[PDB]
Amino acid sequence: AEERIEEEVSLYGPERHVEAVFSFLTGGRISDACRLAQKSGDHRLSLLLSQMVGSQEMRELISLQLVDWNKLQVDHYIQEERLR
Amino acid sequence: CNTQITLLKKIVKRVTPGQQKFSKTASILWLLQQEMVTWRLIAALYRDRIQSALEEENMFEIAAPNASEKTIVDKLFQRDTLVRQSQLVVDWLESIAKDEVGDFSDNIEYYAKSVYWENTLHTLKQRSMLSLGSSRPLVSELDPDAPIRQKLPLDDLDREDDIRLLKYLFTLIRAGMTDEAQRLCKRCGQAWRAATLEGWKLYHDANINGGTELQAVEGNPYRCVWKTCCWRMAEDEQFNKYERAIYATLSGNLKQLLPVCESWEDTVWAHFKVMVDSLVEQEIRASIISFNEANELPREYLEANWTLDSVFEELQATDKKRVLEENREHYHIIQKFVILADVDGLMDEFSEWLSNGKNLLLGHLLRFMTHLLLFFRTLGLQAKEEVSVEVLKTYIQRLIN
Amino acid sequence: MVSVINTVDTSHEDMIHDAQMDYYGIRLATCSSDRSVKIFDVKNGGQILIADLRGHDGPVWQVAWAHPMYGNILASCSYDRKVIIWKEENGTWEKTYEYTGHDSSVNSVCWAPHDFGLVLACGSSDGAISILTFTGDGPWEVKKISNAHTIGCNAVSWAPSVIPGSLVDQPSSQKPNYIKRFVSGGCDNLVKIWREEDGQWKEDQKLEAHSDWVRDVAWAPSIGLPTSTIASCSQDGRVYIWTSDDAATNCWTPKLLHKFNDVVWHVSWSITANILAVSGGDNKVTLWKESVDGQWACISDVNKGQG
Amino acid sequence: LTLLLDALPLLEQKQVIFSAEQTYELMRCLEDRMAAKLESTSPDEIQKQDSSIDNTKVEMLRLALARNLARAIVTEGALQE
Amino acid sequence: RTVGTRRQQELVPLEKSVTHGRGSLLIDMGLFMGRSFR
Amino acid sequence: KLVTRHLAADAVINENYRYLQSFLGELSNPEHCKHIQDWETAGKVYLDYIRVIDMLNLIQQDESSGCELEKLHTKVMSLCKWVELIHCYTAKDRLAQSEMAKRVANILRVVLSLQQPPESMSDSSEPRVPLRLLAPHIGRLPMPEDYALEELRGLTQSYLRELICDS
Amino acid sequence: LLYAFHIYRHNYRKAGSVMFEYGMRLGREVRTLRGLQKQVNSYLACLNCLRLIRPEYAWIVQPVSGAVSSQIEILELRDLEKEYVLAQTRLTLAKHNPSTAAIAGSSAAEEMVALLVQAGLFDTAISLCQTFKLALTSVFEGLACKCIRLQQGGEAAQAEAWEWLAANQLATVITTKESSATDEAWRLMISYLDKYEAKNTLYHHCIINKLLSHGVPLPNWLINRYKAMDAAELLRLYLKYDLLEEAAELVLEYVDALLGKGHQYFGIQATSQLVWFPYSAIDHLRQALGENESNQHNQAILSKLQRKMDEYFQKLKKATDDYKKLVQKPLRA
């Protein structure tokens, strides 16, 4: 993936956390995926992506939080694919 | 002591604020609390000293290609106890802060919950209707970093609730109750923040040495990256002072922790907490053979030396008036010399206090001094004596009078 | 009354709404409907415009000098809903901060006693009061009291810095937990006293005696007496002196100073003599002093034109 | 800018046709360019992913001008005997 | 030219009652009350 | 605070150590040292700069007694590893830092001039001995990447020459 | 060779120091035309090497060349910028003008600004303002003088003016057969005032103050744009030019703007909240209309305006009383 991902990272110009963030994840290398979160105050994944993570429950509660925003029927004005 | 403290607390709470008659009560109630915290301290430290002296004996495993920190620390505990005493001072100071929290942990549940709500959401829906004049620019997204990334504020109520939550999370962490802080984050709907408080867990894979049953991997293998992120978050002034202090506590950033420490106990705790983190990570790194890097801190960070004395020298150099006032209180002087293991210096302070006026010493302090000397004598640690006899004589004459 | 001193041609193009001398009395700040804040260095006579500070989009209502321990800092507030903080560095005046957190005209600004830090109170026609705090590190912190007055806040004045129990023995090195208070006057006819408790501002008292909009409020400086004194003036032409003899009772008693035939615009205390200056819609400035029997007497009437 | 880049390759050559006092005048022109940019010249086009290259082009020009000047002084001084 | 008109710099003599009923309107009083001196 | 951020840089440019030597001498008392934030750091720093200069000159002349020379060596070898850490958080901070490094280096050169014993008896005082600590201190020494690293490169060239001599 | 040797060793610090020394000594001993242009080439090269530096630690220690106890001064680009901006203003002054060429030779920044203003180089004056911190007041005055050259100018002077107008950035000299070398010169002045945004009426002040020197009748929309910003300053300017009519039309339009008609052409923003009434300016208008009053036209306009203001204040009073009734419903939730 490493060749076609640096083609992609040359094209997705400043910026999109609902696209170039996705392509960096489809071939990890999370080391540099953190320096790229510079533009977000969200290195939540700065240590999460590099590590194995809590798995079973940590990210499952991220999931539950999502389920809950969903049920809340609130936060309708949210990023189109930030949900993806 | 706790039985009488509980009685006196009930008496002081029933008194209308402004009766000068109960001031003697408040002052010696504080003295009684210090005395209770002194018997607990004696029990903790002398139990360790006696147990250590009985096991000042066997050993011994050295090194492995591996570097599971758990294994490095388990091997340290065998041969080094100097670092341990600093963690006992941290655990002691975290226990004091826990006693101050009391049942307030249960009362936090009334203020930090789920709601019938509106909110930034109502203002965003109303702006979609008409272009209302004099409208403050609020965040457009509800992800946790949106306020910082967009440089836009939350609604003033939500911002106040976040500041209040962060203050409570810091109080729970200062009390050693990191699991209650994580439960509070999950209950408030901030399960993401609960996960950020777990990144300090030591990496351990019990399967590396070939067990009969597969055990679950523990801790965070990306600790160095997580710690570097926590350090950057502590230095960023866009974050609230308590959020900075939470991540400062968790990453060893003393400079960003000190601004929220208001008492002597908070200041001592900040120094000892960062000292233990610093020494632990220096040992983990010295155990390393190769690998990449979460940090390259200036050389001033690596040549820094942490000692019991240097902590109390920095406390004397503080600009905080309250800490400088509390640092002159007889019990904090005793606690300093007990931490330093300097019995001879403690006996000089006792000689000075007896010389500056025998009648100015409070009766409970003279009791504490007497029983502390009897405790040291039981350890064959009498530590000078003409003076010990003259303190006892002066206290006996006071009890007679 | 007093011997004639220098005349300053300010080169203005409109009415100066308000004027304040700096702490050492070497500088005069002035502000006008012309949207400027002008600074004059009138040392030993010699009128001298040293700055024309432009940054407001509407009439400037009030100016306030900070304590000189923070350097040469001036606050201004305006009809444009902004508060601007001006600072002099190396003889150059610059806008160092701008606060835009009010929805209507900001009518009054007052610096806290320097013992509390660099703190500014701001009263607005939106009915809110904002407390701006500078800690030395980072941006200004803002504590906003929403709905402080029902219609609008016209005036704010800080209480003097009083150490609780200053006659009680204390350690050589200690921190004096000051009771931070200020008074506000509003278009709801109320004079309100505020207190900081646990880092939040609460309404401590409501003072009810005016029958129309409170125009100005001035907390008397502490002359080392236990009695706290506030002056207020109103659209109803009354001036009240509010006294509290015991800080523990929080009991404020109104005394009518005088009733003018026209609006009273501003009230200001003399630092050393407990003399009240009162400015009326009759274009007069009257000076008042309490006599030994507790009566208030007019000691001077200053008309526009006797200089 | 385009013309200054052309001049850069030209000076680059092992032998430079341009005189030392000629491209010192070119340096003057470049400084004037920078000054006008900072102000009058369209700020939008000034902000391009090119500044690094430009600075590298300017350093190459300074080196070529200094090397030509040192050679020119030696040859002109050797013809004055 | 180089002469001037001649700026009338009076804080106006004594027009009053007009602007006064005008302000009797209680809808706004902060402008009514710009005229005098704090 | 104040002294450091201003008077020290100007007194080094003008080299007015005396006027600075009172305030820092009076702050260096064993009871005042207990209470000064950053005391350790800056106290040591400036006090030492001035002291080193003075001691050096005077002793050298005097008769260059050995023991003070041991204690000057001890102070100087540690001071390498303290000039390493200056946190000049602001501009002038860095301005002054540079200024001082420069002047100190000049003075040190001149002083070493007649330093470790001119070898009249040896074939001209060849510096065969090489100190690893000086090289380690230079690596941890912090200053601008231009002039400071150029000086480091010169030191590295000297070390290479010493290695060639050892060969 | 000193200079070339320093340049070969990438010693930009040393190169700058040596070129500075060169220019000092140059001027010192060589007060001829040629040796003085060498002073110049040397300062030019100093600045040039110094500024062709490195990056993260691009910062190079700079010591004042106390040799034409020596103090050490750190410049950065900034202060030697000041110095050669001064040098080049002298240079152009001497190119454009010969006698002040000599006085530039012995002249300073402000002096060069003055010389440029005299030779008629408005663009040169603007460049001097950008270099020396004397603002664009002088530059605005020069552009304004060029604008005047259009209002009260002559054939031969109009023919010569196209040369200096073309030498300044009018990126849009549309030579329409209607816009003469005078219209394009005034467009260049406007574009230079725009290219220098400032938070003050300074540029409109300097243009108006320049026009009113002999009087002027600046274009409907330009006046409308000024009103969209500066209703007062116009009125003060009108008083200076003593035009009674235009002042009354401006007040009628400003009152219509406050009432909701064309408010966008008057910088006016208007459940009632705030309504600033410019009572002091209206009272000055009443005084100014009262100090003369011979004309029967200004009095007819004044009476029409007063009647309309009374209608407005009566409706404002009603709307304010109805808002007070609306705000009183509900403290019964």
Residue of B nearest to C170 (CA): B325
G240 within 8 A of G232, measured Cβ to Cβ? no
The C-alpha atoms of residue B240 and residue B114 are separated, in whole angstroms, by: 23
Please count the helices (runs of H) and the strands (runs of E) in chain B. 20, 0
Q: What is the 3-state secondary structure (H, E, C) of chain G?
A: CHHHHHHHCCCHHHHHHHHHHHHHHHHHHCCCHHHHHHHHHHHHHHHHHHHCCCCCCCCCCCCCCCCCCCCCCCCCHHHHHHHHHHHHHHHHHHHHCCHHHHHHHCCCHHHHHHHHHHHCCHHHHHHHHHHCCCCCHHHHHHHHHHHHHHHCCCHHHHHHHHHHHHCCCCCCCCCCCCCCHHHHHHHHHHHHHHCCCCCCCHHHHHHHHHHCCCCCCCCHHHHHHHHCCCHHHHHHHHHHCCCHHHHHHHHHHHHHHHCCCCHHHHCCCCCCCCCCCCHHHHHHHHHHHHCCCCCHHHHHHHHHHHHHHHHHHHHHHHHHHHHHHHHCCCCCC
The C-alpha atoms of residue F64 and residue F52 are separated, in whole angstroms, by: 14
Taking any CB pair shorter than 8 Å as contact, residues of chain G touching chain D are: 1, 3-5, 7-8, 41, 44-45, 47-49, 52, 127, 130, 169, 195-196
Which of C18, C265, C283 has the CB atom closest to E33's CB atom? C265
Contacts of G76-82 with C-beta under 8 Å, sequence gap 24+, read G77/G47, G77/G50, G77/G51, G80/G16, G80/G20, G80/G43, G80/G46, G80/G47, G80/G50, G81/G47, G81/G131, G82/G109, G82/G131, G82/G132
State this model's resolution in angstroms. Answer: 5.6
The DSSP secondary-structure symbol of C160 reads P
Question: In this structure, what token pair is assigned to residue C235?
Answer: 């659209």
B27 within 8 A of B362, measured Cβ to Cβ? no
G59 touching chain F per CB within 8 A: yes
DSSP H/E element including C193: strand C190-197
B226 within 8 A of A47, measured Cβ to Cβ? yes
| In the block, residue with structure tokens 């002087």 | B333
Chain F interface disruption, residue of B301, B310, B313, B336, most F CBs within 10 A:
B313
Chain C interface disruption, residue of G202, G273, G274, G287, most C CBs within 10 A:
G274
The answer for B357, left when phi > 0, alpha when psi is -120 to 50, beta otherwise, is: left
The C-alpha atoms of residue B201 and residue B70 are separated, in whole angstroms, by: 10
Going from the C-alpha of G263 to that of each of B37, C92, G269, the distances in angstroms are 73, 37, 7
Give the distance, in angstroms, between the CA of residue C37 and the centroid of all CA atoms in the same chain: 17
Q: What is the 3-state secondary structure (H, E, C) of B197-220?
A: CCCCCCCECCCCCCCCCCCCCECC
C87 within 8 A of C71, measured Cβ to Cβ? yes
Cα separation of the two ends of chain D: 42
Question: In this structure, what token pair is assigned to residue G287?
Answer: 């005084």
Q: How many C-beta atoms surround the C-beta of residue C206 within 10 A?
A: 11
Which of E5, E10, E21 has the CB atom closest to G242's CB atom? E5
**Do the Cβ atoms of G72 and F145 come within 8 Å?**
no
B151 within 8 A of B228, measured Cβ to Cβ? no
What is the DSSP pairing of strand C60-65 with strand C296-303? unpaired
With 0-12 CB in 10 A as exposed, 13-18 as middle and 19+ as buried, what is A8?
A: middle
With 0-12 CB in 10 A as exposed, 13-18 as middle and 19+ as buried, what is E26?
A: middle
Which of chain G's residues have a Cβ under 8 Å away from the Cβ of C13? 232, 236
Q: Where are the alpha helices (DSSP H) in B16-81?
A: 23-54, 69-79
G5 touching chain E per CB within 8 A: no
Q: How distant is the Cα of F59 from the closest Cα of chain B, in angstroms?
A: 31
The C-alpha atoms of residue A33 and residue A21 are separated, in whole angstroms, by: 8
Q: What is the 3-state secondary structure (H, E, C) of G126-141?
A: HHHHHHCCCCCHHHHH
For G211, residues 6+ apart whose C-beta sits below 8 A from its C-beta are: G144, G147, G148, G151, G218
The DSSP secondary-structure symbol of B51 reads H
> How many degrees, rounded to 5, is the angle at CA C29 between CA C24 and CA C32?
160
Which of B300, B303, B316 has the CB atom closest to F35's CB atom? B316
Which of chain A's residues have a Cβ under 8 Å away from the Cβ of B229? 34, 43, 46-47
Which of G250, G213, G218 minimizes the C-alpha distance to G231?
Answer: G250
List, edge to edge, every strand of the sheet that includes C276-280.
Answer: C264-269, C276-280, C284-290, C296-303
Q: Are 3 or more Cβ–Cβ pairs between G and C shorter than 8 Å?
A: yes
Q: What part of E 1-38 touches C (C-beta under 8 Å)?
A: 11, 29-30, 33-38
- Sequence positions preceding breaks in chain G, C–N over 2.5 Å: 68, 270
Q: Are 3 or more Cβ–Cβ pairs between A and G shorter than 8 Å?
A: no
Which of C11, C125, C136, C139 minimizes the C-alpha distance to C62?
Answer: C125
For residue C63, what are the β-bridge partners?
C76
Structure determined via: cryo-EM
B143 within 8 A of A42, measured Cβ to Cβ? yes
Q: How distant is the Cα of G330 from the closest Cα of chain E, in angstroms?
A: 19
| In the block, residue with structure tokens 């968790």 | B250
Q: Provide the residue count of chain D.
A: 81
DSSP H/E element including B118: none
* Chain E contact partners (≥3 CB pairs within 8 A): C, G
Q: What residue type is assigned to position B273 of the chain? A: K
B256 within 8 A of B244, measured Cβ to Cβ? yes
The DSSP secondary-structure symbol of C114 reads G
Which of D28, D35, D39 has the CB atom closest to G195's CB atom? D39
Q: What residue type is assigned to position E13 of the chain? A: P
Residue D43 exposure: Cα atoms within 13 Å on the Cβ side: 5
G64 within 8 A of G70, measured Cβ to Cβ? yes
Q: Provide the residue count of chain F.
A: 167
Chain B interface disruption, residue of F38, F85, F137, most B CBs within 10 A:
F85
| In the block, residue with structure tokens 């190079």 | G60
Cα-flanking dihedrals φ and ψ of residue C55, to 5°? Answer: -170, -20
Handedness of CA G163, G169, G170, G172 (dihedral sign): positive
G15 within 8 A of G43, measured Cβ to Cβ? no
Q: What residue type is assigned to position G127 of the chain? A: S
The DSSP secondary-structure symbol of C244 reads E
Handedness of CA B241, B244, B248, B249 (dihedral sign): positive
**Do the Cβ atoms of C79 and G280 come within 8 Å?**
no
Q: Are 3 or more Cβ–Cβ pairs between F and G shorter than 8 Å?
A: yes
The C-alpha atoms of residue G308 and residue G298 are separated, in whole angstroms, by: 15
Question: In this structure, what token pair is assigned to residue B43?
Answer: 């029990």
**Do the Cβ atoms of E33 and C263 come within 8 Å?**
yes
The answer for G135, left when phi > 0, alpha when psi is -120 to 50, beta otherwise, is: left
B35 within 8 A of B63, measured Cβ to Cβ? no
DSSP H/E element including E28: none
The C-alpha atoms of residue C101 and residue C119 are separated, in whole angstroms, by: 16
Q: How distant is the Cα of G162 from the closest Cα of chain E, in angstroms?
A: 28
**Do the Cβ atoms of E33 and C215 come within 8 Å?**
yes
Which of A43, A31, A48, A17 minimizes the C-alpha distance to B232?
Answer: A43
Q: Following CA atoms B105, B106, B111, B112 in sequence, which dihedral angle do they give, to the nearest 10 degrees?
A: 70
Q: What residue type is assigned to position G267 of the chain? A: G
Taking each helix axis as running N to C, give the angle between helix D20-38 and helix D51-79, from 0 to 180 degrees, rounded to the nearest 10: 150
| In the block, residue with structure tokens 């408790």 | C197
The C-alpha atoms of residue C121 and residue C128 are separated, in whole angstroms, by: 11
E12 within 8 A of G283, measured Cβ to Cβ? yes
Which of G7, G47, G195 has the CB atom closest to D40's CB atom? G195
Contacts of C247-254 with C-beta under 8 Å, sequence gap 24+, read C247/C162, C247/C179, C248/B18, C250/C204, C250/C205, C252/C193, C252/C205, C252/C207, C254/C207, C254/C209
Q: What residue type is assigned to position F127 of the chain? A: P
| Residue C16: strand, helix, or coil | strand
For residue C297, what are the β-bridge partners?
C289
Which of chain E's residues have a Cβ under 8 Å away from the Cβ of G309? 22
> How many degrees, rounded to 5, is the angle at CA B204 between CA B202 and CA B208?
160
What is the DSSP pairing of strand C190-197 with strand C28-32? unpaired
Cα-flanking dihedrals φ and ψ of residue C88, to 5°? Answer: -95, 125
The C-alpha atoms of residue B199 and residue B178 are separated, in whole angstroms, by: 12
Please count the residue pairs, one from chain B and one from chain F, whose beta carbons lie less than 8 angstroms apart.
Answer: 26
Residue of E nearest to C304 (CA): E11
Which of C204, C202, C257, C253 minimizes the C-alpha distance to C234?
Answer: C257
C134 within 8 A of C88, measured Cβ to Cβ? no
Going from the C-alpha of B44 to that of each of B85, B91, B228, B339, C168, the distances in angstroms are 11, 10, 34, 12, 38
The C-alpha atoms of residue B169 and residue B148 are separated, in whole angstroms, by: 20
The C-alpha atoms of residue C83 and residue C108 are separated, in whole angstroms, by: 9
C82 within 8 A of C126, measured Cβ to Cβ? no
The C-alpha atoms of residue C282 and residue C261 are separated, in whole angstroms, by: 8
| In the block, residue with structure tokens 């908070």 | B266
* Chain F contact partners (≥3 CB pairs within 8 A): B, G
Secondary structure (DSSP) of B320-378: -HHHHHHTTSHHHHHHHHHHHT-HHHHHHHHHHHHHTTGGGS-HHHHHHHHHHHHHHHH
Q: What share of chain F is helix, strand, coil (3-state, %, to 5)?
A: 70, 0, 30
**Do the Cβ atoms of G274 and C104 come within 8 Å?**
yes
Residue of C nearest to B329 (CA): C171
Residue of B nearest to A68 (CA): B189
Which of C13, C15, C79 has the CB atom closest to G276's CB atom? C79
Q: How distant is the Cα of G50 from the closest Cα of chain E, in angstroms?
A: 51
Going from the C-alpha of C63 to that of each of C48, C101, C238, F57, the distances in angstroms are 18, 18, 25, 59
Residue of G nearest to E20 (CA): G313
